[PDB]
Design an enzyme around this catalytic site. Structure first.
Site, PDB file in Angstrom:
ATOM      1  N   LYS A 161       1.762  -8.495  -4.592  1.00 47.91           N
ATOM      2  CA  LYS A 161       1.163  -7.880  -5.762  1.00 47.91           C
ATOM      3  C   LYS A 161       1.711  -6.483  -5.978  1.00 47.91           C
ATOM      4  CE  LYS A 161      -3.168  -6.465  -7.765  1.00 47.91           C
ATOM      5  NZ  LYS A 161      -3.136  -5.104  -7.200  1.00 47.91           N
ATOM      6  N   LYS A 206     -22.371  -8.528   1.030  1.00 44.37           N
ATOM      7  CA  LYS A 206     -23.508  -8.244   0.171  1.00 44.37           C
ATOM      8  C   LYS A 206     -24.778  -8.811   0.795  1.00 44.37           C
ATOM      9  CE  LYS A 206     -21.017  -8.053  -4.201  1.00 44.37           C
ATOM     10  NZ  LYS A 206     -21.029  -8.573  -5.594  1.00 44.37           N
ATOM     11  N   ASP A 260       1.163  -2.751  -7.280  1.00 38.05           N
ATOM     12  CA  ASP A 260       0.005  -1.875  -7.364  1.00 38.05           C
ATOM     13  C   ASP A 260      -0.377  -1.625  -8.823  1.00 38.05           C
ATOM     14  OD1 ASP A 260      -0.558   1.618  -7.071  1.00 38.05           O
ATOM     15  OD2 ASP A 260      -2.000   0.031  -6.626  1.00 38.05           O
ATOM     16  N   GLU A 261      -1.662  -1.360  -9.051  1.00 37.25           N
ATOM     17  CA  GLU A 261      -2.176  -1.334 -10.418  1.00 37.25           C
ATOM     18  C   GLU A 261      -1.584  -0.204 -11.243  1.00 37.25           C
ATOM     19  OE1 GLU A 261      -6.340  -0.549 -10.601  1.00 37.25           O
ATOM     20  OE2 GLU A 261      -6.140   1.479  -9.801  1.00 37.25           O
ATOM     21  N   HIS A 296      -5.951  -8.159 -13.835  1.00 38.25           N
ATOM     22  CA  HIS A 296      -6.518  -7.158 -12.952  1.00 38.25           C
ATOM     23  C   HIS A 296      -7.619  -6.409 -13.678  1.00 38.25           C
ATOM     24  CE1 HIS A 296      -6.249  -3.460 -10.274  1.00 38.25           C
ATOM     25  NE2 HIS A 296      -6.522  -4.462  -9.460  1.00 38.25           N
ATOM     26  N   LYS A 347       0.782  -1.234   0.000  1.00 43.64           N
ATOM     27  CA  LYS A 347       0.000   0.000   0.000  1.00 43.64           C
ATOM     28  C   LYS A 347       0.819   1.292   0.000  1.00 43.64           C
ATOM     29  CE  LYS A 347      -2.500   3.565   1.136  1.00 43.64           C
ATOM     30  NZ  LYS A 347      -1.926   4.886   1.502  1.00 43.64           N
TER      31      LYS A 347
END
EC number: 4.1.1.39
Lengths: 456, 77, 73, 453, 73, 456, 73
Positions: D185, D318, D187-188, D278, D159
């Protein structure tokens, strides 16, 4: 952050000339203020925090942060606001449209506290404009290659017919081009499909082009569709089309993507063909007025990535509430300096740094009685596509092309002598359709339109 | 039209078959009906693929022996 | 969570992101000797090791309630 | 011949097994009937005519047109209907999904006589499924490649990515992977910005992977983002990531497109790399119910073109219907034969003809108290991405890694015994945390016990 | 936006969905009533507009048979 | 397995539309039943076991298993049966003919308990048809490239000459093409041999083609034989033949194999030449009626792998016991849907999913008095090769070509007007051979045939 | 081998493929202590290790006599 003003909503802040500005139109959930929603949109498009618990160890803070510097209400609508926010320049890669898209609109459109979000405009600084290549050729070079000065150019898509054999396709293309048109466009659903593979289509179309251009005396073309499943297949189609000596090709920039469009634009710049972009699958993104990405943003991103012609849609049948917006983003892609004017949808002042322009293409069910309007409205630098207004002439393909050519030259020659084209469109066309049977038949098949009281 | 002409031209060289002389030669509908009937007979009991072809054959024949033969076949022994 | 009229602001930390350590109450020393004995009273707080704060659990330090980025859940 | 017939709404027509079916939910303008609007949707997305004055040049058409065959209305909502449409097989080319998208959702969404239009499902025949490549590897092959059996996989997202030099990035990756995670991962939106270029980052990440791999004894990995501005740069990044010895890469299939994703999938099959997809920039298309393209259609198109993992988003919070919908298309990514169950969103029966599966990925800042639920919803064929749930531990990165690892394997073991995960989740977590300090610190920090009814 | 009879998805009224329509200047023999200076069809047997085919495409829908979005082609 | 019905002979089973069906004609050893022989053929073509001792540990079985669902006796013959068995779709690679062959006919033909085995037909599902490429061009494209409509095409092999120089070869080709033929074929034994290497032959043949086509006005060709020892040598010949501008090449698909034929078909599809397949060394496999692989199976495998023309052999001299089979198979490679009909040898209903067709070539010792028959048996979608009926005219090469051309056009012109070609073949030819000495001389030496009583 | 009228079916196992272990006779325990002593009486059968079956030698488990694939010999 707290009653302290969030460190992201800073109304006393004025942006640098190297900041990328963005204007969202948002509508928030019941029981949520406007300022909080603005600061949250600002924090979602970047580091996703208001505080400094992650993003402060030594100095990593206040450098990669999207301040929000303006919020106002929309006139007319209730519970609907405009938020202007401003990003630094160090967040973006040099020369990539994919990165700008996935950094602005990456995952803010899924924010829960927002009922709906739309991206209305965007402003690229000059420092970022100059790292992209732009259109391969532009307007002036594209006009000099073909040697067509003064008038707008004509074209005729072959859309209703389907399942055509490659030879009959070449035949229809020949009949159109010989009669007096300039370009001719493939249906955009036509790729290599079992009834018509691509290499045969390319062969016969090239033969038709050579014949008609040799026996007419000017330069003809045909937008060959090189949209493919892979980068390899697409580059292969494009190389073969250059070998045959074709001036122009075609692509779909929304289903194929921006990586493939950038690659193809660099190839076209190296090898000297022109690129015609076809906007398909766009209403999926920019039809509803309360969610999505308005189309002027994609027009700017295409002027950056690459492309010489772009479909923009006609304005003959709209009101001044949308005719204004379309004229606005048609100026946004031809000129070199556009001043902020909210009546035409332009939010920010954009300066393009002597990058060439693209060329708007007006298409879709138009016929001869529209030619007076289009001529003045879109101007000389436009391409006019006639889908059915050509192929349906009462007695053939070549006569329809001749009719459209005659009408266009009549209208432009009349505009050169000062005559109005709102008061005197019909009588111009009728006076021209007296020494030519083709234009008489064409005028008799369709029907006059009578735009408004006497003008517009 | 192509399939009709092909069936008409295929009719003569089936001199020996099942129920060949019950479809006359000087009528096109009966040639086409014979084609459909012989193609359906190259199957087993209904399976909904033989009855479709029998009903196609009945919808084009135009003699009367053809009709009562195809009725003997499709509906009741 | 959230404060209500302004829904986004965290209600547990009021936007601080960090909060006083709930184990040592901001003292930085363990109140009691642990059963394991690794952590002893009056030496160091077991959870924060003397820093006297942690991240607020509700917002995981973001000060954001319901943000798609950070604590989306 | 007159159009009172409409010649496109054929209510008794039953569709073949080599027709591509599509199901639209539309709502028409005031004053327009429903069946006319269905016929108009069938004609817009094909030869745009009801008549035969062009196509019948020489006795050749009615085989390149779609035809609506069922226009039931929607329960609850009023002035909104469902429309089923069947397209022949010889309209599309093989191996190209851009062609399917262009031919179905081309200009139909711009139709003027309808207020709104959404595309809910689609059914590819086996004849057409069998001409695409599919996932490079699948599920069985990748569990065998990574050698991890009988439990989900664990991943962490980093992050504080911005303004972090390449070497500190490598050190953080090393700390996390050494603790017990499997994947980290990228970051995008980190490709090649001036403060951190890509070669300088691939280097240090590979170094950290090699170090931790040996010490942990486990096969480690880091998704390296290869999204580039061109086909050339994308291929250069992928070739370099292969030369270093990396086992997995990353891509964004909605911003880069489908042509680039198909090219990358073919490369990855030829060179033994796994591919993680992604899903950035998706809410632009499929958030609002009235207009867009539901996400299960894009999940199907992805399974066709290529991809091994796919983000799908948590389902823990949800309400219902909206939750049973998600589960729905998870089964359209792992299962090979799926029967029509409209309660879970599946409209048509889809048979995949022994094409491999795709691995769901649950993401969204989940913490340890969510471990039971997830472990029993997605099962063991999934990855669990943790954001702040790993980097926020009071002690560091390696303690947070070990905390999540311990919680996961504890939940898995109890589930094997048959203890109900949801009912005993708080209890299972509490007992494990007794002989482990890290899990105890985590239990307390994330006070969210997340009551389970 | 012509709609035939009752409101529908604008099946064009000018032709009621026929797409083609009778051509205006030919009666019975595809003859040309009009006499014109060019003289190609002035003499009689061949109608000037439809050249004897006795139909043309409908001007309102351009042969499509319906309006709405697709006035085009 | 035991008195339990073998788990492979399941007569109550109906196959799915994604199963590959196969029909064997087998004859078993004395003292062996029919059902067990059927189940054994089913078990040999797949996992070679009846039981589950290997192929069951957890799940992996009862899927990759070839059930046998029908057995019946052949009418007329005794101790001879038909066995229909059905394989799943997951056993076969996507796009490979080699794999299908080596999986069906791999090692079943050596089963000991079977006295003889023949493979009579096969049915590919559509799901498998659509993974192959098919013929490069087909029938309609191949007809449009050459611009020959209406009539069948003519050709003349140069067979009996061997040991000619390269220049005299070019000379004979020129004399044949100038006189009025369309194609011309190399002897299939001619490769680069010490008296005539390949590059010289290619050069002089290309020169002859250019001369004759320039001074005649239509498109001529010559099937150049690119069969080679290696993949490299073969691709090299093909590239050089494309460079000279040749329309069509040639290959042997049974001695060279299916890997080389698939490779060449993909090259031809990329580069736009047509491919003519020559069936040599086939009687080694499909002459005897009790063992081997009937030829319709190889015709299907060739339509899948690739090829535009295929030799099928004439039917002018056969009875309706084999004329039927040849017509049946000819339809199996031109049309798009063929219904099951056992009188013409078609066992299963095959649907080709809009894949193009191939073009049958009828050759081998035919002359003018056959032209009435051929023109109405093969129809006009075919090619006619005249070996000796052309080169042996009493006074040269070009007159023989002229004679054949005149006869063909006379017969086809007559056919259209409705005249019969079984009753009135001879008198058609005699009435045409009155204003042309060439056709008179040709009719002289060649004798009339008088097919039958008055027809067939 | 084979049963005769139906030649293919194995005669030793009658198509079972597996058969009762001939050493322990399906008992799964060794009848006698082995000379080597590795295998002892009443513990585990040496040949099958308790599974009580083996593959039939004649057909090697195939249930096929004379098949080209499996036991071709």
């Amino acid at each position: 952050v707290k009653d302290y003003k969030l460190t992201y909503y800073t109304p006393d802040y004025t942006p640098k000339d190297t900041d990328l500005l963005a204007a969202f139109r948002f509508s928030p959930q019941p029981g949520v203020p406007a300022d909080e929603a603005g600061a949250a949109i600002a924090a979602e498009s970047s580091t996703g925090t208001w505080t400094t618990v992650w993003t402060d160890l030594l100095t990593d803070m206040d450098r990669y942060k999207g301040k929000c510097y303006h919020i106002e209400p929309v006139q007319g609508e209730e519970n609907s606001y405009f938020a202007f926010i401003a990003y630094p320049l160090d967040l973006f890669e040099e020369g990539s449209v994919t990165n700008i898209l996935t950094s602005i609109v990456g995952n803010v459109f899924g924010f829960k506290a927002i009922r709906s979000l739309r991206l209305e405009d965007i402003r690229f600084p000059v420092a970022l404009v100059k790292t992209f290549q732009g259109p391969p050729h532009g307007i002036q070079v594209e006009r000099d290659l073909l040697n067509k000065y003064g008038r707008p150019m004509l074209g005729c898509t072959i859309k209703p017919k389907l399942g055509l054999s490659a030879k009959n396709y070449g035949r229809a293309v020949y009949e159109c081009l010989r009669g007096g048109l300039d370009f001719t466009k493939d249906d955009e659903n036509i790729n290599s499909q079992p009834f018509q593979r691509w290499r045969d289509r390319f062969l016969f179309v090239a033969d038709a082009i050579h014949k008609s251009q040799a026996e007419t005396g000017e330069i003809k073309g045909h937008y060959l569709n090189v949209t493919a499943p892979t980068c390899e297949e697409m580059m292969k189609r494009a190389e073969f089309a250059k070998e045959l000596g074709m001036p122009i090709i075609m692509h779909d920039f929304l289903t194929a993507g921006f990586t493939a469009n950038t690659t193809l634009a660099k190839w076209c710049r190296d090898n000297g063909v022109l690129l015609h972009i076809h906007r398909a699958m766009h209403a999926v993104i920019d039809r509803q007025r309360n969610h999505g990405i308005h189309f002027r943003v994609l027009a700017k991103c295409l002027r950056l990535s690459g492309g010489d012609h772009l479909h923009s849609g006609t304005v003959v049948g709209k009101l001044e509430g949308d005719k204004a917006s379309t004229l606005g983003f048609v100026d946004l892609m031809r000129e070199d300096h556009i001043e902020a004017d909210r009546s035409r949808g332009v939010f920010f002042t954009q300066d393009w740094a002597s990058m060439p322009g693209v060329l708007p293409v007006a298409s879709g069910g138009i016929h001869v009685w529209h030619m007076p309007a289009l001529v003045e409205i879109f101007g000389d630098d436009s391409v006019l596509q006639f889908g059915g207004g050509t192929l349906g002439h009462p007695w053939g393909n070549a006569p329809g092309a001749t009719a459209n050519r005659v009408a266009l030259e009549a209208c432009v020659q009349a505009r050169n002598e000062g005559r109005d084209l709102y008061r005197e469109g019909g009588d111009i066309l009728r006076e021209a359709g007296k020494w030519s049977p083709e234009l008489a038949a064409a005028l008799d098949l369709w029907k006059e339109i009578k735009f408004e009281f006497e003008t517009m | 039209a192509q399939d009709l002409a092909r069936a008409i031209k295929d009719y003569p060289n089936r001199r020996g078959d099942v129920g060949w002389l019950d479809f006359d030669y000087n009528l096109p509908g009966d040639c086409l009906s014979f084609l459909y009937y012989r193609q359906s007979r190259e199957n087993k009991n209904p399976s909904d693929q033989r009855t479709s072809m029998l009903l196609q054959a009945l919808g084009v024949a135009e003699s009367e022996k053809a009709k009562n033969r195809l009725n003997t076949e499709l509906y009741g022994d | 969570q959230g404060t209500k009229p302004n829904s986004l602001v965290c209600a547990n930390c009021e936007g601080e992101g960090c909060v006083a350590c709930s184990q040592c109450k901001g003292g930085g020393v363990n109140l009691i000797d642990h059963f394991n004995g690794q952590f002893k009273a009056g030496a160091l707080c077991w959870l924060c090791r003397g820093k006297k704060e942690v991240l607020c659990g509700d917002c995981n330090g973001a000060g954001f309630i319901g943000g798609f980025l950070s604590t989306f859940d």
